[PDB]
Design a protein around this ligand. Structure first.
Ligand SMILES: Nc1ncnc2c1nc(NCc1ccc3ncccc3c1)n2[C@@H]1O[C@H](CO)[C@@H](O)[C@H]1O
Ligand SMILES: [Cl-]
Length: 379
């Protein structure tokens, strides 16, 4: 009744927080972020880690990227383009996309908001296990570029999940609230949010004038994120396996998916150490894949992708009509900002200035959404 949660409903990962400072809630697996994945099996519906974990064995019925579909028409160019690359089926029901899956031996179709509602239900349950009581008040975040239809469908996913959605707020706004950047006093505060997540890259320039938020500019690449760096590691390893065993593994989907899972793990380790070891038992034709990679080789494999994050920053400043020196704060959002080379590129681009990464980048949005939920529920 007097409690409220903040939920970052992300494209690839979701996060839930409660202001108590903010407490970001760890899930049953102990993770502070949860995959935005829903898997339909012969016996049940799996949400989060359990869904992401069995993707190699059930790709057709493991749904992710519902956020790319939510609030869009089926005939939308983005939907038609995205459909080609997903292993699950997207169908047309009255010009609204639905994901069609096999669930308990039968064909079933779900609206993007229904799928999102299952991720939201998991986030709500995670919060409930932490607080020891039912909680329904929540603030859910969306990208600043989301249109009214996308915001309404996101809100609908909240209602389907049993949540009272206090407000739908922009992700870069939530990240600025997490750092208290709306509480610095009278006058204009210019904030740049650099968000590099699992699958998308968003740059936002915000102006906070006497506590009031204005989005002056948005730029980025909707199709650039953590998964592209995992794939550069996949390509490198496929090439390594070819040189070591004279065999191409590319056409064996299970082997590729397994290698990609190991690559995402090695990438995360490389943010905190200078070397990482891949330990894959029987990757292809009964051959084990035990190898290592250095932070330096990883930076080289992703160099062009890391560098391409700077052009949208330049375009956002241009559109905001602001120079680098006019930006008061530089805020890192998204799990991929954890990469030291990404941080170095943005710091060098901002003439050696400090970057805000004190709050875990993949938690800053839910942190901010929880602060906003606490303000709305108290008032
Ligand atoms: N230390 C890092 N170094 C480079 N990248 C990183 C990263 N920690 C994360 N995410 C946080 C995360 C994601 C999954 C996890 N599973 C298990 C345990 C911790 C986990 C933490 N990322 C990437 O951010 C995106 C959204 O999570 C994904 O592409 C993820 O690979
Ligand atoms: Cl380090």
């Amino acid at each position: 009744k007097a409690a409220a949660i903040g939920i970052d409903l992300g494209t690839t990962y979701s996060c839930v927080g409660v202001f108590q400072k903010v407490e970001i809630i760890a899930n049953d697996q102990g993770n502070r972020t949860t995959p935005s994945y829903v898997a339909f099996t012969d016996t049940e519906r799996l949400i989060g880690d359990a869904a992401k974990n069995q993707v190699a064995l059930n790709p057709q019925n493991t749904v992710f990227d519902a956020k790319r579909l939510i609030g869009r028409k089926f005939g939308d160019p983005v939907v038609q383009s995205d459909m080609k690359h997903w292993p699950f089926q997207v169908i047309n029901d009255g010009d609204k996309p639905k994901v069609q899956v096999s669930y308990k031996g039968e064909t079933k179709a779900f609206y993007p908001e229904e799928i999102s509602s299952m991720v939201l239900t998991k986030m709500k349950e995670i919060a409930e296990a932490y607080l020891g009581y039912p909680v329904t008040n929540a603030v859910i975040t969306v990208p600043a570029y989301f249109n009214d239809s996308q915001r309404q469908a996101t809100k609908d996913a909240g209602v389907i999940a049993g949540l009272n959605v206090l407000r739908i707020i922009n992700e870069p706004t939530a990240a600025a609230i997490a750092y208290g950047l709306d509480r610095t006093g009278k006058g204009e505060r210019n904030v740049l949010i650099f968000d590099l997540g699992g699958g998308t890259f968003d740059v936002s320039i915000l102006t906070i004038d006497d506590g009031i938020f204005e989005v002056k500019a948005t730029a980025g690449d909707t199709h650039l994120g953590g998964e592209d760096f995992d794939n550069r590691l996949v390509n490198h390893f496929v090439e390594e396996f070819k040189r070591k065993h004279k065999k191409d593994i590319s056409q064996n989907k299970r082997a590729v998916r397994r290698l990609r899972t190991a690559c995402e793990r090695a990438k995360r380790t490389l943010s905190s150490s200078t070397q990482a070891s891949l330990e894959i038992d029987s990757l292809f034709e009964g051959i084990d894949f035990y190898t290592s990679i250095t932070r330096a080789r990883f930076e080289e494999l992703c160099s062009d992708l890391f560098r391409s994050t700077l052009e949208p920053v330049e375009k956002a400043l241009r559109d905001a009509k602001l120079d680098k020196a006019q930006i008061h704060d530089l805020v890192l959002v998204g799990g991929s900002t954890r990469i030291p080379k990404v941080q170095k590129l943005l710091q060098d681009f901002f003439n050696g200035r400090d970057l805000n990464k004190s709050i875990n980048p993949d938690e800053a949005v839910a942190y901010g959404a929880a602060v906003q939920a606490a303000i709305l529920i108290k008032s």
